[PDB]
Amino acid sequence: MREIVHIQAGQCGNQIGAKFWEVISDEHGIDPTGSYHGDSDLQLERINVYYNEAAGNKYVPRAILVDLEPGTMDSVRSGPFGQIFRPDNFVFGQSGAGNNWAKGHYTEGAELVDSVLDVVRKESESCDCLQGFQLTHSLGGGTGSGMGTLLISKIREEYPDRIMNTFSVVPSPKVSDTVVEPYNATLSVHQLVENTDETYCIDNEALYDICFRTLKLTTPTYGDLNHLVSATMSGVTTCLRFPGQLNADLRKLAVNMVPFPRLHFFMPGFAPLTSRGSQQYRALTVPELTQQMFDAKNMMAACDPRHGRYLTVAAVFRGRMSMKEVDEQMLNVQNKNSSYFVEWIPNNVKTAVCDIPPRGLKMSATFIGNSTAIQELFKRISEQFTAMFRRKAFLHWYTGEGMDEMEFTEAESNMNDLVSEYQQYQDAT
Amino acid sequence: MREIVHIQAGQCGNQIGAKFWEVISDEHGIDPTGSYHGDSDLQLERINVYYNEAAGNKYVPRAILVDLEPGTMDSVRSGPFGQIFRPDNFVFGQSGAGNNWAKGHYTEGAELVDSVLDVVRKESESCDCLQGFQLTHSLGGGTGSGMGTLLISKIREEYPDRIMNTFSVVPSPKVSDTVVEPYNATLSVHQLVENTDETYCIDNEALYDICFRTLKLTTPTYGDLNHLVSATMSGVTTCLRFPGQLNADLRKLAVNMVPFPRLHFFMPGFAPLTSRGSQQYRALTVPELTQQMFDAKNMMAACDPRHGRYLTVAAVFRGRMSMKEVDEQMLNVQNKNSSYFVEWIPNNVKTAVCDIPPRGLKMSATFIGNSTAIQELFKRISEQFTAMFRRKAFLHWYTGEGMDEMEFTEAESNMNDLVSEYQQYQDAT
Amino acid sequence: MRECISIHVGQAGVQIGNACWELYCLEHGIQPDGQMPSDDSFNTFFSETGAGKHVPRAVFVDLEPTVIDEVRTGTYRQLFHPEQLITGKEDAANNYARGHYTIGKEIIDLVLDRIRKLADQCTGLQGFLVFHSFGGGTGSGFTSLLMERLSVDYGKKSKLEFSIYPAPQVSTAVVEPYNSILTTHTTLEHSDCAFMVDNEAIYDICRRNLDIERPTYTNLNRLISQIVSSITASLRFDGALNVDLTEFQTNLVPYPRIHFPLATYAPVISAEKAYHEQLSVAEITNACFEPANQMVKCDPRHGKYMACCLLYRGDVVPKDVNAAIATIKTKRSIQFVDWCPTGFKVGINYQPPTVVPGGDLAKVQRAVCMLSNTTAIAEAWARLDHKFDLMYAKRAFVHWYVGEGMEEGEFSEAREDMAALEKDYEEVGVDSVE
Amino acid sequence: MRECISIHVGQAGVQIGNACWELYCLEHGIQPDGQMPSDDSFNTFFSETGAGKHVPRAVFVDLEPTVIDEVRTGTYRQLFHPEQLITGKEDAANNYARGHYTIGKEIIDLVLDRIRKLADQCTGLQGFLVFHSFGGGTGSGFTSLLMERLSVDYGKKSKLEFSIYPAPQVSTAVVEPYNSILTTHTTLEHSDCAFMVDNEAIYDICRRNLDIERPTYTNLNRLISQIVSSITASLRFDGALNVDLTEFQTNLVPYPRIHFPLATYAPVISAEKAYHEQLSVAEITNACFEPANQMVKCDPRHGKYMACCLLYRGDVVPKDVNAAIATIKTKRSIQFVDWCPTGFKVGINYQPPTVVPGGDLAKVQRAVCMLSNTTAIAEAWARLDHKFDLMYAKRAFVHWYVGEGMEEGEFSEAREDMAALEKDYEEVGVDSVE
């Protein structure tokens, strides 16, 4: 009942997802072997959504790991929680994506996509009632951007009613981790506005600020940034896995959050986030978790929400808490920040309250914001795209892989369509 | 009651059969000596079909080993389970077949066929009620193709009511293990369409793929390929040897599977097939065993079933399983693959459910498919036959052994009769 | 299973590989016998026999037998497959026409036969690592013959070159301006990304940064080996953010003509300066964009970076990576091109760069190999054309080249193509209109 | 019980058998005394006495006593039955007419008397292994006399010949084009499958592949012994996929005229290259189809393979066999004939090829003897006819042959038959219509 196939593309999605399955195994009491070792039966009540039970009462994840180089697969299978995945799911190429969208979407990824879809379809037949698919990847890579968005196009054709929520790392504003990431992100947002029901825009610059300013980690590795995404990834699907006083699923967080079918680009958020020292100097209350989410310094996307208006806001809560204390605070941020919310959607907060907190926490939250603040996320990329494309630089690596300049013109026109739409409904009254 | 005389021709059939009697001795608890050492009395309930009990409570196989060179007989009698066969059964020549059909069917094999039939008839008198004879051989060899198909012609004359199921290794599509195997296979299919009630087409190329892709054996020997055939050979005759909730025999799998008396060329299949690592990452269920059989990568013949239509399908099951879970899945593959089955045979799946699994397994299966996908098996050979015969090359080794070109013309006309018949009923409506 | 074979052409190519394959045996615990006492990480460069003997995926080729016979008698005698160590009889002898037409055409089929025996046992062959030079006749002639042949037989493979670019004021041969223009006209349409390295700029680094008054070619080949060990670090070892050979040519080559970045390694310190500084990821990143620490004699302040590639390794935290790179886009001395707002590719590996015994670098916990494609290398090609235009106007040394199988008009074909290449940096380096 | 006697004619035939029967005693643990310290596997080549002394099924025959008296005094003096070691007084002396009419007719009844005493104690006699040459007068004349007699007395037995084909540029005698044409006209209607072997092509393999600057006939006879030990491996030893002497003539002779395949053994390595490569079954199979590793000086790329026979032995897995052969049918350099889509016979044995002490091959775990019948041997017979048409047009050396019992018109009978044989490769090598 409502199973989810998790797909991991790129080095990024394989490294985020390997931390994601570290959280889900902890929330459900699953060992490195794959066997249940928790104490409550609430962990096994909805164990089926992220697990297939094998023989000997072992639960294997319903995860499909996709890459074009075999280096990331060795990091998974030799790391912790690596012997828990099925070896049939590890579908990897040899050449590597080449940090190229066209080598990931046309040349090497199209050779490997039928090796993945035959595993996607094999998992999707063992599911009783399929909820939908989630994909973790990036937009600046080649496998996460080319091979990842190829899978979304080849699944929405085969599963047009399902939900396709992507957890896509967006290129950061300040630093550029890839010289051609304006080209790779723009050719993927062309594929995300047409084939995903919702998409979760994450910046690496924003998680650097949260680990430094909020968590007081002066030296955060990737595994500290992946622990922030994985607690957010499990937080969106936590009322689907555990009982709650006001449940939600991936469709309630899509019906309430997507007013127009292109405008489905979300910014995540998590609370509480305390340091090791500053955790005894703060009380875990619903007003504290509310005021921690709705500021600017807790967005996992590096765009200020004060430069835009929230269309719709989802605040999924976890832990034994009271509903009036929730409903007071969700009203409280709509009074004092009434200019920061959109006008023509009255009461634009969706509340989900689960009953199970994360491990070691008393209560928690998860912010899902659909604002016009990510129009600055695409005004930046389409400026960096047009500055590179007007001199046609780095283009022969993509034109030489079976593409024309028309694909770049249509993908940049499709992005500036969406920039105008967030410009429209921010000023619409 | 319903005894089977197993006949082994060629190097191939002697090497397959020596692994076949390794499985039957394990399924019935028989030592290398020949004495019973199992624990259940269900092993001895139908011990008589593949065994004659001698004095001292020793069971000897009802196997007749035939070759034209003495090299394979030394490999049997000095290997394990070699002291269990009767020394009267080892009927072997000295010269070798010469990789020649005519030296196996006319020159050296006709000298030795009366030494075999006097052992065939001696075994067939000790049988209470004879079920029928099974022959294991190849089609590219000389003894397996010439001497083997000579025995079928000299038994169907003497036993026209019995069943004659052959387990014939068909020449592979890619590699050619014999330069004259288009000549040897075509002169044997002339003898198989007229004298066998059913025939099980096995390719060496397909078992290379199954041992590599499915079982993850990067280095499979012949003894690993023979273990795949032997588990299939025991799987066709397992409801005849053990009780079952829905029994079958070699006649139920011939009445249900042969709609027209020439169209009796089958492709086998087996399930489950897991690696040593990937066996804990998979649950043994009837839906898993069903979806493992009906694909293309589990056929032990190297022809894709998607290029044809199944006329009739037999799926013999083993192990304590439920009949609704079987009957759901046999219906399930007929809905989703309704174009892949033939139309004018409604409900074209024969189900047999035994009660005894193989050794060390919880449950198992055996796929017996009668499809039009083996029209590509004979469009390939008759193309390779006609390309060699149009220049009359390698012909004087067969013309020089008492044959004319008319035998090659009639055998190639008989094959292109059968190619047209599978072309007919695939498109017939 | 991401195998990658490497080719070593000329005396410069082999002597670099003597320090590279010494370094790779230390990174993987491989003995000089090919064994290792007491991890499928070797596989990209090491094929294993039936025993525990790992042999390299290298083709050492030189048209003279001098440098190879030191390899055949050295410490790594037992490491190399003796059919891979390919020699000639007479060298190309600072002659492009002898390397491409006279002597190179003899054993070009012997080398390709040994490339193919490696590529058959490579199930996941990504690309090639051609180590050569621009000055020598073998490194210019035989490479340009070989890059034509590999583009025919393989084509789609990522053929990376690691040239020794000739210095402006240092030139140990006279006809280096002839061999460099003639090898670049050929390999331009065949190579995919050629990483320029200069001798004089590493003379400066071994003197200033490493405090060695008298560095050898042995010392220069250790630093170029740390560059390649940082580029191929993500294949050999599991990293936090990995990078492939197809990803270098994607993120650094905006136009198929311009594929000439310049390598820059940091930190370059000695053991007396292993202390006295902590070497954070922002301390070593500002080392790379400093014009003194680059390994090509060019002023990057006189040009614009088209694309950079910071290959972090060791104890490197990705948050401080963003803290290091975001400061550089604010600076004016590091300026990019107008069409490129996104001018960085970052790779993080978990392995620190190891220290070779007898090496002149200190054991650090982190490093960085900046592979920056910049506009400032057009001044290098403007020098080399001016060195070519002085010599060819008097037709000096042309009789050594025409007499070995070359047309005199082919020099004009290579000079017009380089003049077409010189305006390509001018066409890209300017800013856009509207 | 699958006995097989072997005949050794001429100096070339006996000196091959000195390395063959040395090899067989090592494969079966047989001492040079015929004993073995501490398995009915010997039986195909060794008949046993009442004691534990095994004696070979060999007939060493030469018309001169020089080569046999080295056998009669050598290390394997006590191994051989002294009636089998058959001599004459004067050699045939590079004269086909002396080998067939003058000297051969004297002891032809003595050799057949010793063949029959072996064939009477062979209860399962499969066929004959005639080791001879085409150049010498005994190996050409006395063999052609003997193959007529064995086709009368036995007829249906599989008479395999292992010729030493004369090289194009190497010829150690002058009238080798006369002895080769005259022995081939006779043995064509009598032999069943003759395996061609050349001297110059094994000179190349012992120099290149084995790294011996100065190989002897002792070195060449070790490699031809490994061919026959791979062909007769399935009789002597239990294999996964066995093959008989009747199966070689079946799978390789499409037309009774064309029965001339060429042997090719792999791997051919030394002890320094026993390492540095793993030698899988696909590494050694591409060795056989390489034109450098064949043992007949012909270009197989200049012809079409009619039928091949890959005789694997040792640690060979049959799945990887299919992985090795299926790649070769995809290649264009290995092209077959239009009428033959099925051009392979595979045999797998469980025994690795053993190493003779003092031998120049390394102890490998697997090997392959490709017995490829190809169209490309017609260029060999076109050379040998052209060597025949130059000499016979001036009627040189004819008085040495007419004066020993031969008609001058019989040379035209052998040349017209060879010209009929030359168009047989032309008639088969072309493609079919419709």
Ligand SMILES: Nc1nc2c(ncn2[C@@H]2O[C@H](COP(=O)(O)OP(=O)(O)OP(=O)(O)O)[C@@H](O)[C@H]2O)c(=O)[nH]1
């Ligand atoms: N960095 C570095 N450069 C070297 C080394 N050895 C030679 N070179 C450079 O190579 C350039 C000339 O190329 P060589 O390798 O010496 O000559 P070649 O490539 O063998 O060509 P031939 O002269 O025809 O044999 C010189 O300018 C040297 O600076 C080395 O070990 N390290």
Ligand SMILES: Nc1nc2c(ncn2[C@@H]2O[C@H](COP(=O)(O)OP(=O)(O)OP(=O)(O)O)[C@@H](O)[C@H]2O)c(=O)[nH]1
């Ligand atoms: N491969 C190989 N060839 C040999 C050997 N000994 C002789 N030959 C070849 O045999 C050819 C000539 O045949 P011989 O055996 O010498 O002469 P013959 O067969 O005894 O005939 P007669 O001269 O009449 O005695 C020469 O071309 C040699 O190359 C050997 O030990 N190995």
Ligand SMILES: Nc1nc2c(ncn2[C@@H]2O[C@H](COP(=O)(O)OP(=O)(O)O)[C@@H](O)[C@H]2O)c(=O)[nH]1
């Ligand atoms: N948050 C996060 N981002 C990562 C991680 N690893 C890589 N990335 C990002 O992913 C991008 C690289 O894409 P990648 O999938 O590795 O390239 P590809 O292999 O060619 O598809 C870079 O922009 C990195 O910022 C990680 O562990 N965490």
Ligand SMILES: Nc1nc2c(ncn2[C@@H]2O[C@H](COP(=O)(O)OP(=O)(O)O)[C@@H](O)[C@H]2O)c(=O)[nH]1
């Ligand atoms: N599956 C399988 N096939 C075999 C085995 N041994 C031989 N073969 C096949 O049998 C064929 C050879 O026929 P064979 O009976 O040995 O020749 P014969 O002695 O002349 O009759 C070849 O095409 C092989 O592929 C085996 O152990 N397993």
Ligand SMILES: [Mg+2]
């Ligand atoms: Mg040199």
Ligand SMILES: [Mg+2]
């Ligand atoms: Mg002689």
